[PDB]
A paper describes a structure:
The most prominent such domain has been identified by bioinformatics as part of non-structural protein 3 (Nsp3) of the virus and appropriately named the “SARS-unique domain” (SUD). SUDcore turns out to consist of two subdomains, SUD-N (Nsp3 residues 389–517) and SUD-M (525–652), each exhibiting the fold of a macrodomain. The two subdomains are connected by a flexible linker (residues 518–524) and a disulfide bond. Instead, we have demonstrated that full-length SUD and SUDcore bind oligodeoxynucleotides and oligoribonucleotides that form G-quadruplexes.
In this communication, we describe the crystal structures at 2.2 Å and 2.8 Å resolution (monoclinic and triclinic form, respectively) of the core of the SARS-unique domain (SUDcore, Nsp3 residues 389–652). Two crystal forms were observed under identical crystallization conditions: Form-1 crystals were monoclinic (space group P21, two SUDcore molecules per asymmetric unit) and diffracted X-rays to 2.2 Å resolution; form-2 crystals were triclinic (space group P1, four SUDcore molecules per asymmetric unit) and diffracted to 2.8 Å. Both structures were determined by molecular replacement. The r.m.s. deviations (on Cα atoms) between the models derived from the two different crystal structures are around 0.7 Å. In both crystal forms, SUDcore displays the same head-to-tail dimer, with the SUD-N subdomain of monomer A interacting with the SUD-M subdomain of monomer B, and vice versa. Approximately 1130 Å2 of solvent-accessible surface per monomer is buried upon dimerization. Involving ∼10 hydrogen bonds and four well-defined salt-bridges (AspB440…ArgA554, ArgB473…GluA619, ArgB554…AspA440, and GluB619…ArgA473), interactions between the monomers are largely hydrophilic. As to be expected, the structures of the monomers are very similar to one another, with r.m.s.d. values (for Cα atoms) of 0.58 Å between monomers A and B of the monoclinic crystal form, and 0.11–0.37 Å between monomers A–D of the triclinic form. In all six independent copies of the SUDcore monomer, residue Val611 adopts forbidden conformational angles. The side chain makes a hydrophobic contact across the subdomain interface and is also contacting the side chain of Phe406 of a symmetry-related SUDcore dimer in the crystal lattice in the monoclinic crystal form (this also applies to two of the four monomers in the triclinic form).
Author numbering:
A (entry chain A): 389 to 516, 524 to 652
B (entry chain B): 393 to 519, 524 to 652
């Protein structure tokens, strides 16, 4: 059940803390917390969560007032029914939590809400850059990346883009990952899932100039590409098709699923 | 649009000639689409690989569409959009994206119904001849040791590992094949079900196993059964109680 959303308007954190001290965190099979659950921590010792890893979906781990549940991953085939069932394994109580299974190709906000509402526990739910969206063509993007020395993610499987690159940067040895030849490229495939490309770029944590990842290449429309791009944390200049798409994209990026 | 058929492929070919096959990014066909072939030259499908979701490839009367994979995050909306790229016509086809952790029958039906093309839908591979038993671990191990059958086991189930290590003292537990008293096939809860199923289908040998993914990967019995339809290697499958045998067989024999 969802007792309240902690929007700071209607409900506040310090006031909810009178009701319960218990937190419900969401983890993956590897014992790694979902980003929203990680942002709920304030220097608590989370070492205990790796002491018993790897986990099975539905595994419940408790240390003091922190409870962690191992949830199914949507980007690996997990359904809403599987999500609700992993939540039913949590001992019935009052918890401060977030929407489970957010973001790139993860569960939608409505699916996360449903799973929390279906649960028998009472939940106090905490809620889950625009300045970077441009409308530059490939030429303009390449010129920017060569001048700034920024990393430029590029889908290796877009034939028209590869021909342009090979003609502009003659003798380029195209290979997966980092290729520093005129421009510092980051070559990725349409085979590698978007969430995986995003994790690799988030890890590399450096300035990027890119198109919205997965748009067309991985079967995403603009909205779906934007929703996945929310999970990109590395500083990025993001180029959309037309100037008309800039506002559209910003709208999808700024919304709630 | 749709006309679900009780009749065979060779029989349906009297109605129309065009086939709609479903492929992945690598240009490899989905199992149901591969079973629709009768020695046709499929080399052309590799000539232009890798593909993007939505790519349409035609040679003669065979049309292939690159569909999104549900077991990799694909949605129904993505599936319907890839299908809208297929030229409007009459096709003999199957339900797209069937398989383990693939799209459900209702999601596949919806995507085909959303499409403007007219379909003659051949049934999926699913079902009398069943080896569903209700054996406990000890019984399963005794059977595997005497028959020398391969016994898939989830390495991350602590209680199962303790039993194994106590029965087969000195066992060096490692991923994959470990031949020590029983020929085990150790897998992780990290590896997806469809991937374990593919590895076992490839090894193609007699198995004695519990329904793959049940509990370990978050599946309830119904979901584990639905994934088990994709298992083709000969298998003895053990469920909890004798009461679960019929329940499981029901889920295995059913539609979705």
């Amino acid at each position: 059940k969802i007792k309240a959303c902690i929007d700071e308007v209607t409900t506040t954190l310090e006031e909810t803390k009178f009701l319960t001290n218990k937190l419900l965190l969401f983890a993956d099979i590897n014992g790694k917390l979902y980003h929203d659950s990680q942002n709920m921590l304030r220097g608590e010792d989370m070492s205990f969560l790796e002491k018993d890893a790897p986990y099975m979906v539905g595994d419940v781990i408790t240390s003091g007032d922190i409870t962690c549940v191992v949830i199914p991953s949507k980007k690996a085939g997990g359904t809403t029914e599987m999500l609700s069932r992993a939540l039913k394994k949590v001992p019935v109580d009052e918890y401060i939590t977030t929407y489970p299974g957010q973001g790139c190709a993860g569960y939608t906000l409505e699916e996360a809400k449903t799973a929390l509402k279906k649960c028998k526990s009472a939940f106090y739910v905490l809620p889950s850059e625009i300045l970077g969206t441009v409308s530059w063509n490939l030429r303009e993007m390449l010129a920017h990346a060569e001048e700034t020395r920024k990393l430029m993610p590029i889908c290796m499987d877009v034939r028209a883009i590869m021909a342009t690159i090979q003609r502009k940067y003659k003798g380029i040895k195209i290979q997966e990952g980092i290729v520093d030849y005129g421009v510092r490229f980051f070559f990725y495939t349409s085979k590698e899932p978007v969430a995986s490309i995003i994790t690799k770029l988030n890890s590399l944590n450096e300035p990027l100039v890119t198109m919205p990842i997965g748009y067309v290449t991985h079967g995403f429309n603009l909205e779906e590409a934007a929703r996945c791009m929310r999970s990109l944390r590395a500083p990025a200049v993001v180029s959309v098709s037309s100037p008309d798409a800039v506002t559209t994209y910003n709208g999808y990026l700024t919304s709630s699923s």
